[PDB]
Each structure stands twice: as C-alpha cells, then as structure tokens.
Amino acid sequence: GSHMKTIQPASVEDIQSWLIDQFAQQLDVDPDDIDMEESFDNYDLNSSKALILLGRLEKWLGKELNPVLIFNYPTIAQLAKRLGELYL
Questions:
Q1: Hey, CA dihedral for 48, 80, 10, 2, is it positive or negative?
Q2: Domains in the chain, please, with CATH?
C-alpha cells in the first residue's frame, strides 16, 4: 500500500484522506493521528494557516475556494463532505 501523497477528488473519501494527510504533513505526524471530527482551531490551523492548505485544495479540485468553509466546516468530516457537494 501507498496512500499518503495526494490523489484526486472523485469521492468524499478521497477529499477526507487528502485533508488528513495534508494535516499530517503540516503537523509532522501520522494521518491516523488526525481527528477529522475535532475542531480545526485547536489543531495547527490558526488564521493564515487556512489559505496555505486552501490554495492547494482548490487547485487539486480544479476550482477556487473561500475562507467561509473553515468558518462553516471546521473539521475534515464536514469540510471534505461539503467539498463533496460544492464540487462532486
């Protein structure tokens, strides 16, 4: 197995595992260390931190993004899900 190095968003499962590993790689931890249910404001995220991951995320998905999604889906399980609606 080798799932820890970006894929493509075809399903909310892809978008979750992207967000997760991209959390892992910012935090210098495991992907399995990431709570997709815990609020991001208590992880590595901050204020500026968002735009870094966002400007990767939108491009990975082929579009733009907006900061409201942090302020609305501040967890992988909700963010990835809503991305599965805005995009998928």
A1: positive
A2: 1-88 (1.10.1200.10)
